[PDB]
Design a binder for this molecule. Structure first.
Ligand SMILES: *CCC(=O)N1CN(C(=O)CC*)CN(C(=O)CC*)C1
Lengths: 245, 13
């Protein structure tokens, strides 16, 4: 997250921190995700496509810090890693950038709800907020494009949804943005998601309900003028989500 | 020209 502010996991209780275990035993952060039901975390396919082996992954819930334990955090293995069969990447655009991780602790349990661990609601079909609406993003991604390390403390920011009209302007993304994607940006281009935020949630209040509207997918640089964050449009993937769940 | 969001946990030669 470029700019924004530090947050805590009680403020983002659906946020899932996804890591990968390496031979030798080293563990590195991969991507964010969102808890959509006790046994299921939703994220982005591109985070896993080169290493599609479920055994490799560790998922934390209730965790505020990248390399430390947070009190009440739960650790999970991945019982099922499900990537979208139609995933593909163009020069910038990522298509069908969506993945499901069925989670289970070593004892076989799914998430236990708490102050720091809660599910987030899915939108209804084709039902997204109006463009100009503010939504939040959350993650452990880079604070600046020049960074090569991720911050220790979870971050959030607020960005506005950008219309397809605007996001398909030639100085933005042209026709590389499709109707299965949502663009979101800071009007002054100061805050945005960035590398390492991928797979994490774009959350919008719909009818006083916090709703998973987008999944961090792609963009040209981070917080670049005329280059919004681009998000998998969760409201267009409900059949896919419901089937595999 | 690659999207930074895209560059997580990827394989390279
Ligand atoms: C341009 C996007 C791309 O081809 N890939 C994603 N990626 C990056 O390193 C982008 C930061 C891994 N890829 C490589 O080819 C690494 C050698 C593929």
């Amino acid at each position: 997250i470029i700019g924004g502010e530090f947050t805590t996991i009680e403020n983002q209780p659906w946020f899932a921190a996804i890591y990968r275990r390496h031979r030798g035993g080293s563990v590195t952060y991969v991507c964010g995700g969102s808890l959509i039901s006790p046994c299921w975390v939703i994220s982005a396919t591109h985070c896993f496509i080169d290493y599609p082996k479920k055994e490799d992954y560790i998922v934390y819930l209730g965790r505020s810090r990248l390399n430390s334990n947070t009190q009440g955090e739960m650790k999970f293995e991945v019982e099922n890693l499900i990537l979208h069969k139609d995933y593909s990447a163009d020069t910038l655009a990522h298509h069908n950038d969506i993945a499901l991780l069925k989670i289970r602790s070593k004892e076989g349990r799914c998430a236990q709800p708490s102050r720091t661990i809660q599910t987030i609601a899915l939108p209804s079909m084709y039902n997204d907020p109006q463009f100009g609406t503010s939504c939040e993003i959350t993650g452990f991604g880079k604070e600046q494009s020049t960074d090569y390390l991720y911050p220790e403390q979870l971050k959030m920011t607020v960005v506005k949804l950008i219309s397809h009209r605007e996001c398909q302007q030639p100085h933005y993304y042209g026709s590389e943005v499709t109707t299965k994607m949502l663009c979101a940006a800071d009007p002054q281009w100061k805050t945005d998601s960035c590398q390492g935020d991928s797979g994490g949630p774009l959350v919008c209040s719909l009818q006083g309900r916090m709703t998973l509207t987008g999944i961090v997918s792609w963009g040209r640089g981070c917080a670049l003028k005329d280059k919004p964050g681009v998000y998998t449009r969760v409201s267009h993937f409900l059949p896919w989500i419901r089937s595999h769940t | 020209l690659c999207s930074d969001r895209g560059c997580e946990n990827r394989w390279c030669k």
